[PDB]
Ligand binder design. Structure first.
Ligand SMILES: CC/C(=N/Cc1c(COP(=O)(O)O)cnc(C)c1O)C(=O)O
Ligand SMILES: CC/C(=N\Cc1c(COP(=O)(O)O)cnc(C)c1O)C(=O)O
Lengths: 462, 463
């Protein structure tokens, strides 16, 4: 219905366009050639998913983690906040350091900083710009940046534009490789050995595309062991941690009581807090470093009053406890899904054959908590088929593929929200087990499964 | 207020001395901050002295006084009220489930008001320029850009896939002609029309206040690129709302919406909120959605953020900013006649004591802009700022790194909500400073400090 109208528009947008641009001007000629590169691998993005916004599909893909957007709970606290300041000055006035600072944004920052256990906060338009500012301002020449290989794109963009000359990745969440990265970096840099420069460790609290948790206590112990002079500093991107983890959604850093051990923390408002923006946490020296050396911040207009107001409304819902029930239902529904798919008859054969792989679902009971992020892996030549199977079953997931991940690591990303139900989770489990069945029967018989046939049929027409 | 200047005075006291047993990371961080303090140009809280009412606003970016009057606020809240059940959260990135009908419809309203085929909305003008210059240039293309394009344009070009980036002297048609032709003559794939030259300009330049001669550069581009293998990119941050009928900006005013492939219009200035739109055909828009990785990997704008942009443009389309816009023109022409009619103007400008280049031949233009950069001698620049501030006139001082080392100045912004009496006081204050400086220099005492600097140097001693 509405599922099939967007599949058609998606199929149609991958038709190569350059063979029609021979007469077009050179500028548009080469742009449509560049778009054709993506079309050729069927990865041209246009209008997104959105079948869940209309009711035509379950929402297992959006970032509305606590359903604050779905319920209108944030909108009502947002309008209530604007009503506490009639005649508010909407316009900031300019750059935050030249005409754009005002009392209400400083007060909201300190309010948030107090709630998350930090000394100071600085507000950005987004988590991305938060990362851009951190890694263009904070790293000094002679510093070293050691980062998890799956840090966010904005972190990669910030580090590339950094003043630091030494940046070394380490294998994802691997405490051994992080040790090897730390000590091999120390040994070859005499300025780190005598403590005249620092090593900056860059990690995410919860990884957007894997769903696992940074072992921060252990990394901090490794760091102190390698750098006994204390010349290290951590930077924790809690994008997918805020609102999900910790008492009243404070995140992983405060949950572990590391608020004095992690020098820089980024908390974003784009997921659980159901709006946009971010704050960078640190002491007053970090904050003044961003205001003075993060040129991206210096040359952009400061947040408007409504933008600050929606952020404050979201932390209000967190800090007054209004999100606590939604926060536990995530834990419940993720465990409920984990129990249900690992208890179905076919999970064992499908896991050996490699038909389905959900690594976050294994050993889940030994963790202090679970995450909302559940990537589901299949065979790489089955990935689009798994997507079409769920999509045609009226379950909206996010497909992950090149360029978003390396060209061989394709997967499906399922998001469990506080506003989902056990009936919907049962439907997701049953839907996945039908797919695992279909591919095992094909593997035991060149057949193409039902769902893919229908999508390939629509292509043969469009 | 004395308090804002006192706080600024304290923020310049060096701190590296107290940092010994301070850990390496905070010591090196505060050592970098000291580099700014030792030149007295550390920034902390800005210039908000005007915001309360204790100083005249000649500094903010609220050009049409939409923020001051609450006009945009009232329309913004009525727009929210006409959508009582709006979905606040976008859902994710614009290409992954953050798209919705409201933002697309708003985009097309802005495109059609601006005379463009499509529009694409960003969090900021800076993010728009980032997206343009990382997504649009192809390998083999050349970028010819005005040296004074915005910081975000410089960041975007440095992350670009184009391998020839050529700057040219600001607003200079001969320098631009020389950049275009020497770039054309050294690239066989520009000569044969298979790659393109991208031309990057601001319609109104944020710190010199002058206007890009866009019709002249298009003529020169077509001359040097007879195959038409070129494309212009016009950043209109300081034109939207303030230039053209009903604020449509410079490109539409000259009727060049079909000759300028990419346009950036921003909401941080005269439109009194935040955000931007990139304008172009659907090939440009798809290019940004697929190759601007900054856009792909960030959350899509929430409903209230879209609605205030809509309210701003709706104000412009109902003609509710035209009188504010005519007021700007009146007040800037009034400042220009006033200051150049002053007694000391001839002497102060011959001596380089005062210099306002946008005040020269302002009558030979079709319009003026709101940006009045005021120069003095480089060693007097903070003295000029102190003098203006203590006279309760809020201006924004402009020093390294915002500008080159020896190009420090002070930026006055004329807003619609300003008055002729406020302009009279500014001129009187400027003439006092010029007179005080001419006296000090002819008195032959190289240690003589002006009055307003004496007070600042006093508080520095006390505090
Ligand atoms: C930061 C205050 C400011 N910005 C100027 C500016 C921007 C940034 O746009 P945005 O703030 O990211 O929406 C973009 N392009 C031009 C030409 C500009 O002059 C100013 O001139 O005081
Ligand atoms: C919206 C795309 C997305 N994640 C965003 C994200 C950001 C950017 O945050 P912002 O949208 O600029 O505020 C920063 N750090 C991490 C770890 C992230 O995962 C996702 O997983 O769908």
């Amino acid at each position: 219905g509405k599922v099939v109208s967007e599949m058609i528009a998606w199929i149609k947008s991958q038709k190569l366009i350059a063979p029609r641009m021979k007469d077009a001007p050179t500028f548009y000629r080469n742009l449509e050639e560049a778009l054709d590169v993506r079309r050729s691998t069927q990865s041209l993005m246009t209008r997104g998913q959105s079948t869940w916004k209309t009711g035509d599909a379950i929402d297992f893909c959006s970032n509305d983690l606590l359903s604050l957007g779905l319920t209108g709970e944030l909108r009502r606290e947002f309008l209530a906040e604007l009503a506490r300041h009639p005649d508010f000055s909407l316009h900031s006035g300019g750059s935050r350091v030249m005409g754009g600072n005002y009392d209400y944004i400083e007060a909201v920052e300190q309010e948030i900083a107090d709630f998350l256990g930090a000394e100071t906060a600085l507000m950005f338009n987004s988590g991305s710009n938060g990362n851009i500012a951190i890694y263009t301002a904070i790293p000094r020449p002679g510093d070293a940046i050691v980062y998890d290989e799956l840090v966010h794109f904005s972190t990669h963009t910030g580090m590339a534009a950094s003043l630091a000359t030494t940046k070394v990745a380490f294998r994802h969440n691997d405490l051994d490789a992080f040790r090897e990265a730390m000590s091999s970096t120390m040994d070859s840099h005499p300025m780190l050995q005598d403590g005249s420069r620092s090593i900056l460790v860059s990690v995410e609290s919860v990884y957007s595309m894997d769903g696992d948790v940074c072992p921060l206590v252990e990394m901090l112990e490794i760091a102190r062991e390698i750098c006994p002079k204390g010349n290290f500093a951590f930077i924790a991107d809690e994008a997918h941690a805020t609102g999900v983890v910790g008492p009243r959604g404070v995140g992983l850093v405060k949950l572990l009581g590391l608020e004095n051990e992690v020098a820089i923390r980024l908390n974003t408002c784009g997921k659980a807090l159901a709006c946009t923006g971010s704050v960078v946490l640190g002491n007053a020296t970090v904050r003044n470093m961003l205001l003075n050396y993060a040129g991206s911040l210096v040359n952009t207009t400061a947040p408007s009053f409504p933008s600050v107001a929606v952020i404050r409304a979201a932390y209000n819902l967190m800090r007054t406890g209004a999100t606590q029930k939604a926060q536990d239902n995530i834990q419940h529904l993720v465990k409920y899904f984990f129990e249900s798919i690992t208890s179905s008859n076919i999970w064992d054969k499908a896991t050996d054959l490699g038909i389905l792989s959900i690594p976050v679902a294994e050993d889940y009971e030994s963790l202090d908590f679970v995450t909302h992020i559940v990537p589901i892996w299949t065979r790489q030549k089955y990935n689009w088929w798994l997507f079409f199977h769920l999509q045609l079953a009226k379950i909206a997931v996010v497909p992950i593929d090149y360029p978003q991940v390396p060209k061989g690591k394709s997967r499906v990303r399922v998001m469990i929200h506080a506003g989902n139900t056990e009936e919907q989770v049962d439907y997701l489990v049953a839907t996945l087990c039908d797919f695992a069945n279909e591919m095992i029967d094909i593997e035991e018989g060149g057949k193409i499964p039902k769902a893919a046939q229908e999508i390939y049929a629509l292509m043969a027409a469009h």
